[PDB]
Symmetry: none
Subunit: 86 residues, 4 copies
């Protein structure tokens, strides 16, 4: 995919998870730009307490406590994961 | 709004610090926050910590870990000189 | 020598400009010298020229489109930091 | 195949021989896949085609002549070193 396509993927990942751009980039790239694999990675890393509450500052950005943002971000990722799986 | 633009500036400082250093995201946040969001200070902190062996190989996301550290120090120092003038 | 220090800062300006933009060496010198060796202005000049189609695909040392896109994004990211 | 540390010493040597600014040094040596002999030959070819401006030779004689004179002497330095490599 072109940098333009990759950029829009990263925007969408950031929109779903509310994560700051470093984390967005690191997860999506680790998942080899596979959006579904990157949501699973995110949920796993969050399950292992790798992602601090402060990293979810971007949730609801126009482009709620930080602990709440973490919880909602996880729920949004699972919901999206549900849809794209079918 | 302002507080949103505040976060955006922080988010871009982190992203550029990550592109300069190759560090994993946790270390990026750690150093930049320790430098109080001062980008120049964060670069200086990265260079100092690296000289004092406070940045392990594990911290860097062809190249060996040694090569990734060297490249990271050279790039930080290159960007550093430009901020200074 | 202050002259050898003078040249060194110019050489490092060019080197960082090249690393930011991906441009071939002649274009690096052209833009940086046109900005009168001001790194910030050199970045602004690169972005502007690129918007005005004054920088051809051949000037980038991914596709040419992707190398251009990458260059503008990096130039803009550095620019922000210089400006704060 | 070499470490960055080593590649850097190669770039420093290429730069001492040719006196070229660092952008040209890196572009030529990387085009030569870090083969020092190939890089000297590319330098000579590029210079023969008037690709390298006289100002780019400002690093000739650095310690860490006219600009036209430096270009001529750097070409001579590259051929001599090239000679030594091709024993």
């Amino acid at each position: 995919d072109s940098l333009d396509v990759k950029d829009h993927k990263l925007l969408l990942f950031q929109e779903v998870t509310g994560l700051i751009s470093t984390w967005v980039t690191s997860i999506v790239e680790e998942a080899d730009w596979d959006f579904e694999r990157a949501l699973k990675l995110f949920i796993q890393k969050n399950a292992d307490h790798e992602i601090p509450d402060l990293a979810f500052a971007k949730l609801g950005s126009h482009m709620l406590s930080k602990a709440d943002k973490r919880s909602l971000a996880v729920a949004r990722a699972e919901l999206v994961l549900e849809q794209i799986q079918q």
